[PDB]
Coordinates of C-alpha atoms and ligand atoms in Angstrom, one line a residue:
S1 CA 16.4 1.1 -11.3
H2 CA 18.5 2.7 -8.5
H3 CA 18.6 6.2 -7.1
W4 CA 14.9 7.2 -7.3
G5 CA 13.3 8.4 -4.1
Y6 CA 11.1 11.1 -2.6
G7 CA 13.5 14.1 -2.5
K8 CA 13.4 17.2 -4.7
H9 CA 16.1 15.8 -7.1
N10 CA 14.8 12.2 -7.4
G11 CA 11.1 12.3 -6.3
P12 CA 7.9 11.7 -8.1
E13 CA 8.3 14.6 -10.6
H14 CA 11.5 12.9 -11.9
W15 CA 10.4 9.3 -12.1
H16 CA 9.2 9.5 -15.6
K17 CA 12.7 9.8 -17.0
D18 CA 13.6 6.3 -16.1
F19 CA 10.1 4.9 -15.9
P20 CA 8.1 6.5 -18.7
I21 CA 5.0 4.6 -17.7
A22 CA 4.8 7.2 -15.0
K23 CA 2.8 9.3 -17.5
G24 CA 0.6 6.3 -18.6
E25 CA -3.1 5.7 -18.8
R26 CA -3.7 4.0 -15.5
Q27 CA -1.4 5.4 -12.9
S28 CA -1.9 5.4 -9.1
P29 CA -2.8 6.8 -6.7
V30 CA -5.8 8.9 -7.5
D31 CA -8.2 11.3 -5.8
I32 CA -11.4 9.5 -5.0
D33 CA -14.3 11.9 -5.7
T34 CA -16.9 10.2 -3.6
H35 CA -19.8 12.0 -5.3
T36 CA -18.7 10.8 -8.8
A37 CA -17.9 7.2 -7.8
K38 CA -20.8 5.0 -8.9
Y39 CA -22.4 2.3 -6.7
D40 CA -22.1 -1.1 -8.6
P41 CA -24.7 -3.5 -7.4
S42 CA -22.9 -6.2 -9.4
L43 CA -19.8 -6.2 -7.3
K44 CA -19.7 -9.3 -5.1
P45 CA -18.9 -9.3 -1.4
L46 CA -15.1 -8.9 -0.6
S47 CA -13.6 -11.9 1.0
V48 CA -10.4 -11.4 3.1
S49 CA -9.2 -14.8 4.4
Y50 CA -6.1 -14.2 6.6
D51 CA -6.7 -16.9 9.2
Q52 CA -3.7 -18.9 8.0
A53 CA -1.4 -16.0 7.2
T54 CA 2.2 -16.8 7.8
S55 CA 4.4 -13.8 8.4
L56 CA 8.1 -14.3 8.1
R57 CA 10.2 -11.1 8.2
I58 CA 10.2 -7.3 8.3
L59 CA 12.6 -5.4 6.0
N60 CA 13.7 -1.7 5.6
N61 CA 14.0 -1.5 1.8
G62 CA 15.0 2.1 1.6
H63 CA 11.6 3.5 0.7
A64 CA 9.3 1.9 3.3
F65 CA 9.3 -1.3 5.4
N66 CA 7.7 -4.5 4.2
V67 CA 6.2 -7.3 6.4
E68 CA 6.7 -10.4 4.2
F69 CA 4.6 -13.5 4.1
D70 CA 5.0 -17.1 3.0
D71 CA 3.1 -17.1 -0.3
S72 CA 4.1 -20.6 -1.3
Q73 CA 0.6 -22.0 -0.6
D74 CA -2.9 -20.4 -0.5
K75 CA -2.5 -19.3 3.1
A76 CA -3.8 -15.7 3.1
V77 CA -5.9 -14.7 0.2
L78 CA -8.2 -12.0 -1.2
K79 CA -11.2 -12.9 -3.4
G80 CA -14.6 -11.5 -4.4
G81 CA -15.5 -7.9 -4.9
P82 CA -14.2 -6.9 -8.3
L83 CA -11.7 -9.8 -8.5
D84 CA -11.8 -12.9 -10.7
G85 CA -10.1 -15.7 -9.0
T86 CA -7.8 -15.8 -6.0
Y87 CA -5.1 -13.4 -5.0
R88 CA -2.4 -14.4 -2.5
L89 CA -0.9 -12.0 0.1
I90 CA 2.9 -11.5 -0.3
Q91 CA 3.7 -8.3 1.8
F92 CA 2.2 -5.2 3.4
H93 CA 3.8 -1.8 3.9
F94 CA 2.8 1.8 4.6
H95 CA 3.2 5.3 3.3
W96 CA 3.2 8.2 5.7
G97 CA 3.9 11.9 6.3
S98 CA 6.3 14.2 8.2
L99 CA 3.1 15.7 9.7
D100 CA -0.3 14.2 10.6
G101 CA -2.0 16.3 7.9
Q102 CA -0.3 14.4 5.0
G103 CA 1.0 10.9 4.2
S104 CA -1.7 9.0 2.3
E105 CA -1.3 8.3 -1.4
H106 CA -5.0 8.1 -2.3
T107 CA -7.1 11.0 -1.2
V108 CA -10.8 11.2 -0.6
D109 CA -12.4 14.4 -1.9
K110 CA -8.9 15.8 -1.8
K111 CA -8.5 14.9 1.9
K112 CA -5.1 13.5 2.8
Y113 CA -4.8 11.0 5.7
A114 CA -1.8 10.6 8.0
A115 CA -0.8 7.3 6.4
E116 CA -2.0 4.5 4.1
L117 CA -1.5 0.7 4.5
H118 CA -1.1 -1.4 1.4
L119 CA -1.7 -5.2 1.5
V120 CA -0.2 -6.5 -1.7
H121 CA -1.6 -9.7 -3.4
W122 CA -0.8 -11.6 -6.6
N123 CA -3.2 -13.5 -8.9
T124 CA -2.6 -17.2 -8.5
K125 CA -3.4 -17.9 -12.1
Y126 CA 0.1 -16.5 -12.9
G127 CA 2.1 -18.8 -10.6
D128 CA 4.3 -16.2 -8.9
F129 CA 4.7 -12.5 -8.3
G130 CA 7.2 -11.9 -11.0
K131 CA 5.0 -13.3 -13.7
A132 CA 1.9 -11.6 -12.2
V133 CA 3.5 -8.2 -12.8
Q134 CA 3.6 -8.8 -16.5
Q135 CA -0.3 -9.0 -16.5
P136 CA -2.9 -6.3 -16.5
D137 CA -4.8 -8.2 -13.7
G138 CA -1.7 -9.5 -12.0
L139 CA -2.1 -7.8 -8.6
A140 CA -4.7 -6.6 -6.1
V141 CA -3.7 -4.1 -3.5
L142 CA -6.0 -3.5 -0.5
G143 CA -5.6 0.1 0.7
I144 CA -6.5 1.3 4.2
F145 CA -6.3 4.8 5.5
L146 CA -4.8 5.7 8.9
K147 CA -5.9 8.7 10.9
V148 CA -4.4 9.8 14.2
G149 CA -6.5 9.2 17.3
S150 CA -6.8 6.1 19.5
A151 CA -4.0 3.5 19.4
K152 CA -4.4 0.5 17.1
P153 CA -3.5 -2.6 19.3
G154 CA -2.9 -4.8 16.2
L155 CA -0.2 -2.3 14.9
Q156 CA 1.8 -2.3 18.1
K157 CA 4.0 -5.4 17.3
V158 CA 5.0 -3.7 14.1
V159 CA 5.9 -0.4 15.9
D160 CA 7.9 -2.3 18.5
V161 CA 10.3 -3.9 16.0
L162 CA 11.1 -0.8 14.0
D163 CA 14.1 0.1 16.2
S164 CA 15.8 -3.0 14.9
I165 CA 15.4 -2.1 11.2
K166 CA 16.2 1.6 11.3
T167 CA 18.3 1.7 8.2
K168 CA 18.1 0.5 4.6
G169 CA 18.9 -3.2 4.2
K170 CA 18.2 -4.2 7.7
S171 CA 15.7 -7.0 8.4
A172 CA 14.3 -8.9 11.5
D173 CA 12.4 -12.0 12.1
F174 CA 8.7 -11.2 12.2
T175 CA 6.8 -14.5 12.6
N176 CA 3.4 -15.1 14.0
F177 CA 1.9 -11.7 13.2
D178 CA -1.8 -11.7 12.5
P179 CA -2.6 -8.9 9.9
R180 CA -6.4 -9.1 10.7
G181 CA -5.7 -6.6 13.6
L182 CA -5.0 -3.9 10.9
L183 CA -8.5 -4.0 9.3
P184 CA -11.4 -1.7 10.1
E185 CA -14.9 -3.0 11.0
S186 CA -16.4 -2.4 7.5
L187 CA -15.2 -3.8 4.2
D188 CA -17.1 -1.1 2.1
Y189 CA -14.7 0.0 -0.6
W190 CA -13.9 1.9 -3.8
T191 CA -12.2 0.1 -6.7
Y192 CA -10.5 1.1 -9.9
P193 CA -7.7 -0.2 -12.3
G194 CA -4.2 1.3 -11.6
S195 CA -0.6 0.8 -11.0
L196 CA 2.2 0.3 -8.5
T197 CA 2.8 3.7 -6.8
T198 CA 6.6 3.3 -6.7
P199 CA 9.0 2.5 -9.6
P200 CA 8.6 0.4 -11.7
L201 CA 5.1 1.9 -11.7
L202 CA 3.7 -1.2 -13.5
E203 CA 0.1 -1.1 -14.6
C204 CA -1.0 -4.4 -13.1
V205 CA -3.1 -3.5 -10.1
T206 CA -6.8 -3.7 -9.2
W207 CA -7.0 -1.2 -6.3
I208 CA -9.5 -1.9 -3.5
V209 CA -9.5 1.1 -1.1
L210 CA -11.5 0.8 2.1
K211 CA -13.8 3.6 3.1
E212 CA -13.4 3.3 6.8
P213 CA -10.0 4.4 8.1
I214 CA -8.3 2.8 11.1
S215 CA -7.2 5.0 14.0
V216 CA -3.5 4.8 15.2
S217 CA -2.0 6.9 18.0
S218 CA 0.3 9.8 17.5
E219 CA 3.0 7.8 19.3
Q220 CA 2.6 4.9 16.8
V221 CA 3.0 7.1 13.7
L222 CA 5.9 9.0 15.4
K223 CA 7.8 5.7 15.5
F224 CA 7.4 5.3 11.7
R225 CA 9.0 8.7 11.3
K226 CA 12.2 7.6 13.1
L227 CA 13.1 5.2 10.4
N228 CA 15.8 6.1 7.9
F229 CA 15.9 6.1 4.1
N230 CA 19.7 5.8 4.2
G231 CA 22.0 2.9 5.1
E232 CA 24.0 2.5 8.3
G233 CA 26.9 4.8 8.5
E234 CA 25.5 7.2 5.9
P235 CA 24.1 10.6 6.6
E236 CA 20.7 10.4 8.2
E237 CA 17.6 11.1 6.2
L238 CA 14.4 10.4 8.1
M239 CA 11.9 8.2 6.2
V240 CA 9.0 10.6 6.0
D241 CA 6.8 11.8 3.1
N242 CA 7.2 8.5 1.2
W243 CA 4.0 9.0 -0.8
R244 CA 3.3 9.7 -4.4
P245 CA 0.7 12.4 -5.0
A246 CA -2.6 11.8 -6.9
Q247 CA -2.2 11.2 -10.6
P248 CA -4.6 12.0 -13.5
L249 CA -7.7 9.7 -13.6
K250 CA -7.8 9.7 -17.4
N251 CA -10.3 7.3 -18.9
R252 CA -11.3 5.6 -15.6
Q253 CA -14.3 5.1 -13.5
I254 CA -14.1 4.5 -9.7
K255 CA -16.8 2.1 -8.5
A256 CA -18.2 1.9 -5.0
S257 CA -19.4 -1.3 -3.3
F258 CA -21.9 0.6 -1.1
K259 CA -24.4 3.4 -1.3
Ligands
LIG1 CU1 18.9 1.9 -11.7
LIG2 ZN1 2.3 1.1 -1.3

């Protein structure tokens, strides 16, 4: 639907009126209580295969910016871990704060990171993204926390194009970007069944949240905060605090791939 956002009058506390699944049984994000998470020795190794990833474009959609990929062939896929089958990369985006002390969607023992990266993948058994989001195992989102510290060299090409997509609806060419430069050293993770974190809030997602954050510089996150939620020629509303807070865990268990 239109006109949802992150403001006081249309933010997360209002979403349930148009998207009643907002109060559902497997909503995201959640707080990850690390002491309560259980190590699962049955999980298999996570396989991230991005060598042939083919980026196309970057778009300001009014709530974040998306780096889009060619998903017409198995070029960039996620497999293993909790997943059955093959999941194809379609886009990545971030959520971030107005201040370095907030911005992530997931939290770790109630800790909020400065930002969170979401690599969005769809289950190839379902043929395309739109059919995948009608299935309870349709999507897999790999989540990576950002902390402020040293610069992330592999983020810099993304930061450098943001000036060209300041406002809602703007896009730019974004070919030949390698998303492998956004991953931490370790692929140790937590996993649980959840949902999209923005409307339509669909309950289709296997969440895979990496334990190790990546470090980005202050200057890099400051450039995220210069984007606009609004369209060109409309009153400026900085794109900041585009995160949903933690939702009730309900009848779920978070599993860890490590001890
Ligand atoms: Cu609408
Ligand atoms: Zn997201």
